[PDB]
Amino acid sequence: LDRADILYNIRQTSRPDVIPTQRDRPVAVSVSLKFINILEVNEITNEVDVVFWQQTTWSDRTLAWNSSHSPDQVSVPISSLWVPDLAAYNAISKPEVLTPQLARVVSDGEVLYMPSIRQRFSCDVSGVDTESGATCRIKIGSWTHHSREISVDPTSDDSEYFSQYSRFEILDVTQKKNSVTYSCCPEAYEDVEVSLNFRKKG
Amino acid sequence: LDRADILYNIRQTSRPDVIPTQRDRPVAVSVSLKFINILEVNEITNEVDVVFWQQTTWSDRTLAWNSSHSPDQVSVPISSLWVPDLAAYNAISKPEVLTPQLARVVSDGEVLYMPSIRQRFSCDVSGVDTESGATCRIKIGSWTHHSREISVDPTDSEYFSQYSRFEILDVTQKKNSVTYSCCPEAYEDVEVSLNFRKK
Amino acid sequence: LDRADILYNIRQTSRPDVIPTQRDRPVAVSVSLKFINILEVNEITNEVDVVFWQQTTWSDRTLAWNSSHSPDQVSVPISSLWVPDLAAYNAISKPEVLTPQLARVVSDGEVLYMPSIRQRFSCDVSGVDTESGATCRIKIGSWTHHSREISVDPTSDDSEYFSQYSRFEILDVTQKKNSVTYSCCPEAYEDVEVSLNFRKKG
Amino acid sequence: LDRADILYNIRQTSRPDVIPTQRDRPVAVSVSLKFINILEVNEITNEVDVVFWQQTTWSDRTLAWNSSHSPDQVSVPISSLWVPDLAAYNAISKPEVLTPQLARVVSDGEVLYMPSIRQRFSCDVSGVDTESGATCRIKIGSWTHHSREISVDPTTDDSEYFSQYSRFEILDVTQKKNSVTYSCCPEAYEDVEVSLNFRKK
Amino acid sequence: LDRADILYNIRQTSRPDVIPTQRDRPVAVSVSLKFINILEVNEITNEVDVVFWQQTTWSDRTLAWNSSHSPDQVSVPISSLWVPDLAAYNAISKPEVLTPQLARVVSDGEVLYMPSIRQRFSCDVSGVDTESGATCRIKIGSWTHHSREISVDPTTDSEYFSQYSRFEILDVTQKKNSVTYSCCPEAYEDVEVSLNFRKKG
Ligand SMILES: OC1(c2ccc(Cl)cc2)CCNCC1
Ligand SMILES: [Cl-]
Ligand SMILES: [Cl-]
Ligand SMILES: [Cl-]
Ligand SMILES: [Cl-]
Ligand SMILES: [Cl-]
Fold first, then answer.
1. Can you tell me which residues are glycosylated (chain E)?
2. Contacts of E17 in chain A (CB under 8 A)
3. Measured between CB atoms, which of D19, D87, D183 is closest to E3?
4. Burial of A79 (C-beta count, 10 Å sphere; 0-12/13-18/19+)
5. Residue B43's beta-bridge partner residues?
């Protein structure tokens, strides 16, 4: 197969509306935030404007092809793929996607989608101008798929991609798995809670 | 049936333009606002910027499937479904939808659509910096469907951000049904009274 | 007929690009503005930011159906209908439509379209902080259809739907029929001139 | 023919991607800006926010019909027509189109497209608060079509449509045709340079 | 062939989803920024708002046609072409494209795409109000295609820069880099554009 054939096959048989569950197990989605910038912070309103790369991976076996005498990977527009319906629970703006909306598909059906996103959050900005800094928690999970359909799991240097030119610096990033069960319903919705410990540079 | 078959069937036979009335009874739409944040308040202009989850439920029997050896529920893009034409009467900005535009469809044809919306409203901000607080009333109803086509009923502060400059004292919901001088028909709305104050 | 059949028939046959002229007479469009709010006024720049319901009615006989044992009216997306190409001649922002873009179609082919619009205008803001108030004139008519193709005519209490919470109050609204000729072309374009007499409550 | 037939024919045979050149001669595009308002001016940054009607005309013979016992003109969505790829070279915002995106098509294939546009420009705001005023020059031409494919010409009262309520007033509007060879490409690109001489009241 | 036939053929066969690699060599993409304006600078936040023409060229042999008794070039909507998935690594706003989204396709399959973009960047604004000025570095490369799939090269400063900017350009250098990230084995090529500029005195 060449790239043309693989991309034709994916475009022609793409069920972007269909979660690729295998044998009634959840789709395992990995999410890791790489912080790139902290642009605007307001300690009065507890609001932050952040840029991050959202490293997102999952398997869709319907995409897989025999890689013998074929490309190992192709770039696919996300409009031709099922993508997890991830939302930031404490976002106060729509995600501004700064990058081309393409994912990488490996011949085994692994998908890697890593958009650069600028987004505003409601989180704890208290202590931002102190030595110990602020801890801003960002929660990202499936909007409509509970734990039997989508599982979310966290997956380098926290500041490896962070802009040296930000007014802020990163002290620590932790990414941990949470679940919310709401009063209305019995099902749990999984999220990654990303704790961004940062401060204003002196 | 698997998810692929159910979602194919819905996509292929979706009449998103067709209100799913049964036996000439109105479609019963439930609306409950879960307040998440109060972001900007202006007591001079009487304007508020609010984030809420708009819990919206109704039945569309045309979506229903036999759930024996099948999923009980699927996630469906709202572009493939009829959705009530709800509007906030006192909104002064278009709703900014912060979440994926998917609904949950249950095998009995129940639809649950719960977008996170940021929107600006014209309401009473007077008293926001006092102990008793402000009461901001938000009215939501069908823009074009009268009471014989759509009924709206209330089904709320539990998921409010601890980091807001504001706090919720109380949320009350009433149903209103208004017949205007021009027309014979009644228009239903849910009136949500948000009593909040600066911390 | 049921709603499903009527909406199918309209979607299949509507011709949204085709002005429904009868025997080469103009399409009679009625326009009435119901003011809902006055949000921002600037007496220096002579600019106002207003919210209004634009009550718009006309007949399209191609939409009509036999109402015996059928609904008298349906809700139709405006993308499935011909709609008059109305513009505010003194608008300085695009109309922000706040409401679902649906019209009501009666079985005789009468259409009622009433969007809630927020829009900014260039008009006379002088006297806004006085007892007599400002008179801000808004002109609305067809962008491309002259008087032989579209006629515009004005169609309750002026303040009936006006927000009690506005910094402003309405003293009077008058709506009258005008015509504009541009220097380039011989034809007249009909408009409704809406005079909004309002003042600061102070 | 009635309007329904003409609009069906245009919609069914519309090649909006295809420049309607005749025998490898350029498409003659006429462009005239009618200024409606000057909303924000900044003499520090040399930026202006303007509203104008962009009167745009050209011929597309593929649209033409026999007008005997037929309408002489129809309103057509620009999504069903080829439109010149005009750009303002010194625009610093996207054109905000305020009006329905319809053009007039005459039975001979003449197209008239006149959107109301709000747009921000980088131009000379110096002297805006003086008697002689500022001269803000706006250059509009085809982004991708050189002079053998598109020619641009100014059309053959400057304040006739200008808002009486603007903080500003128009002293003069002049339009001149330029034909410029840029470093990237060997071909010449035509533009209309519109000089807006205006001042604060 | 006429333009209508060429544009039909391209629309029917272009494969916009398919990188036009030849014999498993990378697609050679050339990128050069022509700075048009510097609109807003903030030395406190280290943010700049810039307008530039992004001159972008590559070959797609699947677009080629016999140019004998045919146009040498056509204007094609980029939605009908494969375009490199270029991103500015230090952009903090989405690119605001100010120009019609058309590329030029030559009969040999060479593509020229040159949008005017307004975009905000995180870069070194320190020294902007001094004689030596600030040096703001902008890195542009393929978001998803590593060096075996896409190579990025500069073509070899103030020619199109607005005389009305509050700022002036002292120097522009454009040089080729390769970045390997810790997670993954492949290198991604980028053009690093160093914009040395200052406030006019
Ligand atoms: O459906 C969700 C929900 C949240 C809160 C309440 Cl009170 C009810 C339902 C849970 C899944 N994510 C979207 C919202
Ligand atoms: Cl690829
Ligand atoms: Cl599902
Ligand atoms: Cl209906
Ligand atoms: Cl017409
Ligand atoms: Cl061409």
1. 66
2. 7, 11, 76-77, 80
3. D19
4. exposed
5. none
Beta carbons of C115 and C99 less than 8 angstroms apart: yes
The Cα–Cα gap between C73 and C63 comes to: 11
Measure CB to CB from residue E85 to each of A100, A160, A161 and give the nearest one. Answer: A100
- Using DSSP's 3-state secondary structure scheme, residue E8 falls into helix
The one-letter code for the residue type at B122 is S
Q: B179 is written with which tokens?
A: 């017949």
Q: Are A58 and A111 in contact (CB under 8 A)?
A: yes
Is E122 touching A (CB cutoff 8 A)?
yes
Q: Which residues 94-113 on chain D approach chain E with CB closer than 8 angstroms?
A: 94
Q: DSSP label at E166?
A: S
Q: How far is CA C187 from the centre of its chain?
A: 22
Of D173, D174, D191, the closest CA to residue D182 belongs to: D191
8 Å CB contact between A74 and A6: yes
Q: Which two tokens stand for residue E153?
A: 């090269």
For residue E110, CA distances in Å to E56, E73, E103 come to 11, 9, 10
Q: How far is CA E16 from CA A4, C145, D100, E13, E81, in A?
A: 10, 39, 31, 9, 5
SS3 label, residue E6:
helix
Nearest to A3 among E19, E91, E144 (CB): E19
* CA distance linking residue B71 with residue B4, whole number of Å: 10
- Could you identify the residue written with the tokens 């572009």? B79
Pairing of strands A188-200, A168-181: antiparallel
Structure tokens at C68: 């015996």
The answer to whether residue B192 neighbours chain C at the CB level (below 8 Å) is no
List residues near ligand 1 (CB under 6 A). Answer: A 143, 182-184, 189; B 34, 53, 55, 114
Strand D150-153 with D168-181, pairing: unpaired
Other C-beta atoms lying within 10 Å of the C-beta of residue D69 = 7
C-alpha to C-alpha distances, D49 to B177, C122, D123, nearest whole angstrom? 46, 14, 11
Q: In what order do the strands lie in the sheet with D168-181?
A: D86-88, D134-142, D188-200, D168-181
The dihedrals phi and psi of B10, each to the nearest 5 degrees, come to -60, -50
Q: State how beta strands B150-153 and B27-42 pair.
A: parallel
- D11 C-alpha to ligand 6 centroid (Å): 20
Beta pairing, strands E27-42 & E150-153:
parallel
Backbone dihedral angles phi then psi of residue D62, each to the nearest 5 degrees: -65, -15
Classify residue D68 as exposed, middle or buried by CB count within 10 Å of its CB (0-12, 13-18, 19+): exposed
- What's the gap in Å between the CA of D176 and the closest CA on chain E? 20
Residues E103 and E81 sit within 8 Å (Cβ to Cβ): yes
List E73's β-bridge partners, or say none: E106
Longest C-alpha distance within chain A, in Å? Answer: 59
Distance CA E118, CA E52 (A): 7
CA distance C108 to E55: 57
Q: Where are the alpha helices (DSSP H) in chain C?
A: 3-13
d(CA D190, CA D154): 11
Determination approach: X-ray
Inspect the structure and tell me whether chains D and B have 3 or more CB pairs less than 8 Å apart: no
- What are the tokens at A158? 């926290």
Output the CA–CA distances (angstroms, integers) from residue D181 to C120, D158, D193, E105, in the order listed.
Answer: 41, 30, 15, 19
CB-based contacts of E156, cutoff 8 Å, min separation 6:
none
Q: How far apart are CA D92 and CA E102, in angstroms?
A: 19
Chain B: give the shortest CA distance to residue A22, in Å. 11
